[PDB]
């Protein structure tokens, strides 16, 4: 199963039409800033395909 293809799955806002966004900031879920640390209250905004 190819794993190259990827997609955003965690973004703080919806997309206005014809708007691209390729930022790579860990999505904060809790009330503590991620500061580049994934794990608790922090999720990577992307997810791949199999």
């Amino acid at each position: 199963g190819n794993y190259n293809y990827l997609y955003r799955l965690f973004r703080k806002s919806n997309l206005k039409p014809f708007e691209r966004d390729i930022s790579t900031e860990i999505y904060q879920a809790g009330s503590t800033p991620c500061n580049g640390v994934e794990g608790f209250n922090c999720y990577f905004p992307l997810q791949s395909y199999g």
Partner: nanobody
Amino acid sequence: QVKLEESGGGSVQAGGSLRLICTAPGLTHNNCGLDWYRRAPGKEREFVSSISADGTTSYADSVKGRFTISKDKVEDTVYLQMNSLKPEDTAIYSCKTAFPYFGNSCVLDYWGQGTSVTVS
């Protein structure tokens, strides 16, 4: 207020065999990922193995070839069978899982205590 468990260790030599039991109560519903970790005395906690929500498995470089992680079809109690034990395996295992809170069903991550094995 106990949400996970770790047991199944023992005191067996290098080359011995035994089965581990990470009993997850409702991870099928929770559908969050699972990781096996271990700690060695005097050293910080180190990664051991990972299993995802879809059944993709991954093993550490110091454990690849002999460790076998598997997930139940029902009644989540994930197994980490160890075989061909080596003296480097003396450490304490632990689990980690995520649970619902604020509605979102992973946000609260929670760790079990852990169970130690001494390999001679």
